[PDB]
Amino acid sequence: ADLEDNWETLNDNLKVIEKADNAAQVKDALTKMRAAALDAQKATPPKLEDKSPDSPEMKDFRHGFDILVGQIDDALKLANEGKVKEAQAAAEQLKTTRNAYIQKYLGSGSCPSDKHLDAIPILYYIIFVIGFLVNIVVVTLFCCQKGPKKVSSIYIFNLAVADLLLLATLPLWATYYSYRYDWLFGPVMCKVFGSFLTLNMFASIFFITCMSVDRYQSVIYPFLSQRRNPWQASYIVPLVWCMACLSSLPTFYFRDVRTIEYLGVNACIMAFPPEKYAQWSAGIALMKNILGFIIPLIFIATCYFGIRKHLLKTNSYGKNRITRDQVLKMAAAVVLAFIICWLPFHVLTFLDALAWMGVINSCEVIAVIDLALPFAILLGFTNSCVNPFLYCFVGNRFQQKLRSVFR
Ligand SMILES: COc1ccc2c(c1OCc1ccccc1)C[C@@H](C(=O)O)N(C(=O)C(c1ccccc1)c1ccccc1)C2
Ligand SMILES: CCCCCCCC/C=C\CCCCCCCC(=O)OC[C@H](O)CO
Ligand SMILES: CCCCCCCC/C=C\CCCCCCCC(=O)OC[C@H](O)CO
Ligand SMILES: CCCCCCCC/C=C\CCCCCCCC(=O)O
């Protein structure tokens, strides 16, 4: 007897019609749908409870269900005439109006691309070249290297390739933003380069974790080169890319171009099943926090504080303090650079999830989330500019200062 419940009754009876053999089954399902549509018509949308009954938005709201009942009656006519297949075809027209509802009222849409800043496209390209240069230096340095590479370098290389490949998609999103969320590259490049981003970004976050584990292993076990298993890197590297691949599978199944009518543009969005669009957006958002921040941060944090106590356990010399503090400074940078770059995006992601769940119905809050999302998304890309400084460039100084305190 609620708007959310009235739409579940409708989309559930839509399925009954699609799998039916006689017109009596269709007639029965359509009868329930007509009652739900009329009842839903008497349900103010929760996100705009403030708006008065006669506001033009509540006029278009109740009107959407008049179009719906009109289609439900046209199908009932065919079903009463024993035209089961004709009625089923008419029910396809209902999914078209149901799609119009979830865009207009369900989610962020009820509160436009006309919040466009010229800065974002400028900033996105700035990070692109800056990141592509520092990361093309990381890989090229390996050519000029003069020493024995530890398994750590394997993670440095894979971290840079992922950073380069995800940074390589920044021009797509800068142009996508400059054209007010109107995808021009085609429907295949939205599903492809949309998942390709999520793929390399999970890989980037998963390899950052491998680095924090390896460095924690380096402090607790000084003889780690011999202590290692030669095959471990041969197993860990494939495993990371596969975990990143599995983590981005939802993007590949759903990421596709869909036409936003009221905006008149072709957007590259997550095309969830409309009958469960809110539940997926909330669920997928929460898996972004867990797999992409919570679980990762549990490793970096544990590895850091595990390094911190070990260094505090060895000695207390006044000079060795300098060598041990520089290691703590370098271990404290990866953990801080990760939360500074990623905590903004994931907080907004969690809040957006609380919106799809119905907790945050404030439009002023949802507007702030939408206005701050492109900047938070940029800090995520920025950690790809900070990774070269955190590992590669300070990689020679890390190994040396452990061999000093382990003399
Ligand atoms: C056609 O668009 C887009 C398709 C797919 C994606 C995005 C996108 O939006 C991009 C966009 C930017 C600017 C303007 C318009 C769009 C952005 C982002 C997201 O969930 O929302 N995303 C990501 O994998 C995340 C992410 C989060 C957790 C763990 C791994 C990856 C991401 C966040 C921040 C920085 C990089 C990656 C895929
Ligand atoms: C933008 C800045 C806002 C800051 C918000 C950060 C959000 C992440 C929260 C915690 C991650 C770190 C976990 C901290 C847990 C402390 C563990 C600890 O203190 O361990 C002591 C050690 O064991 C001695 O014996
Ligand atoms: C290896 C371990 C990996 C762990 C894997 C992480 C996956 C995410 C886990 C839990 C989130 C569950 C979210 C599902 C619930 C979605 C919200 C919902 O259904 O409710 C919507 C709302 O009620 C309508 O108004
Ligand atoms: C970045 C900050 C992250 C905050 C931690 C939140 C972690 C959430 C983890 C699992 C979500 C649990 C289930 C989600 C709510 C149940 C669905 C519902 O209530 O309808």
**Distance between CA 218 and CA 330 in Å, rounded?**
14
| 379 close to ligand 3 (CB < 6 Angstrom) | no
Report CA(278)–ligand 2 centroid distance (Å).
33
Residues 6+ positions from 13 with CB-CB distance below 8 Å: 29, 30, 32, 33, 36
**Distance between CA 206 and CA 214 in Å, rounded?**
12
Burial class (CB in 10 A: 0-12, 13-18, 19+), 75: buried
Residues 6+ positions from 352 with CB-CB distance below 8 Å: 108, 281, 285, 369, 373
- Which position has the token pair 């095959």? 231
Instruction: Name the residue with the closest Cα to ligand 1, atom 22.
Output: 198
**Which of 297, 304, 277 is CA-nearest to residue 347?**
297
Q: Which fold has domain 3-106?
A: Four Helix Bundle (Hemerythrin (Met), subunit A) (1.20.120)
**Which of 95, 104, 87, 127 is CA-nearest to residue 47?**
104
AA letter at 356: W
Instruction: Name the residue with the closest Cα to ligand 4, atom 12.
Output: 286
Domain spans in the chain, listed from the N-terminal domain onward: 3-106, 114-405
| 154 close to ligand 3 (CB < 6 Angstrom) | no
Beta partners for residue 267, in sequence order: 258
Pocket test for ligand 4, best of 294, 295, 360 (most atoms within 8 A of CB): 294
Report CA(301)–ligand 2 centroid distance (Å).
7
**Distance between CA 122 and CA 134 in Å, rounded?**
19
Q: The tokens of 117 are what?
A: 């800043």
Instruction: Name the residue with the closest Cα to ligand 1, atom 7.
Output: 194
| CA dihedral sign of residues 157, 162, 163, 168 | positive
HSE-up (13 A, CA, CB side) for residue 360:
20
Do residues 275 and 14 make contact, with C-beta atoms less than 8 angstroms apart?
A: yes
**Distance between CA 223 and CA 111 in Å, rounded?**
60
**Which of 130, 295, 340, 131 is CA-nearest to residue 205?**
295
**Distance between CA 142 and CA 385 in Å, rounded?**
18
Pocket test for ligand 4, best of 205, 289, 346, 354 (most atoms within 8 A of CB): 289
End-to-end CA distance of the chain: 74
For residue 301, give the ligand nearest its CA: 2
AA letter at 205: I
**Which of 169, 234, 223 is CA-nearest to residue 201?**
169
HEC per residue, the chain: CCHHHHHHHHHHHHHHHHCCCCHHHHHHHHHHHHHHHHHHCCCCCHHHCCCCCCCHHHHHHHHHHHHHHHHHHHHHHHHHCCCHHHHHHHHHHHHHHHHHHHHHCCCHHHCCCCCCCCHHHHHHHHHHHHHHHHHHHHHHHHHHCCCCCCHHHHHHHHHHHHHHHHHCCHHHHHHHHHCCCCCCCCHHHHHHHHHHHHHHHHHHHHHHHHHHHHHHHHHHCCCHHHHCCCCHHHHHHHHHHHHHHHHCHHHHHHEEEEEECCCCEEEEEECCCHHHHHHHHHHHHHHHHHHHHHHHHHHHHHHHHHHHHHHHHHCCCHHHHHHHHHHHHHHHHHHHHHHHHHHHHHHHHHHHHHHHCCCCCCHHHHHHHHHHHHHHHHHHHHHHHHHHHHCCCCHHHHHHHHHHHCC
Buried b (16+ CB within 10 A) or exposed e, 100-139: bbbbbbbbeebeeeeeeeeebbebbeebbeebbebbeebb
**How many Cβ atoms from other residues are within 10 Å of residue 16's Cβ?**
16
- Phi first, then psi: what are they for 258, rounded to 5°? -135, 145
Q: Residues 126-130: contacts with CB within 8 Å, 24+ apart?
A: 127/167, 127/170, 127/378, 127/381, 127/382, 127/385, 128/167, 128/170, 128/171, 128/174, 130/385
- Phi first, then psi: what are they for 256, rounded to 5°? -160, 160
AA letter at 47: K
Which CATH code is given to the segment(s) 114-405? 1.20.1070.10
**Distance between CA 387 and CA 167 in Å, rounded?**
12
Beta partners for residue 270, in sequence order: 255
| 284 close to ligand 4 (CB < 6 Angstrom) | no
Resolution in A: 3.0
HSE-up (13 A, CA, CB side) for residue 15:
9
Do residues 270 and 284 make contact, with C-beta atoms less than 8 angstroms apart?
A: yes
Q: Are strands 255-260 and 265-270 parallel, antiparallel or unpaired?
A: antiparallel
**Distance between CA 345 and CA 383 in Å, rounded?**
12
Counted residue by residue, the chain has a size of: 407
For residue 283, give the ligand nearest its CA: 3
Q: The tokens of 263 are what?
A: 């905006």
For residues 264, 266, 267, 273, the Cα torsion angle rounded to the nearest 10 degrees is 100
**Distance between CA 292 and CA 346 in Å, rounded?**
8
| 235 close to ligand 2 (CB < 6 Angstrom) | no
Longest dimension (CA), the chain: 95
Q: The tokens of 62 are what?
A: 């109740």
| 351 close to ligand 4 (CB < 6 Angstrom) | no
**Which of 250, 265, 161 is CA-nearest to residue 198?**
250
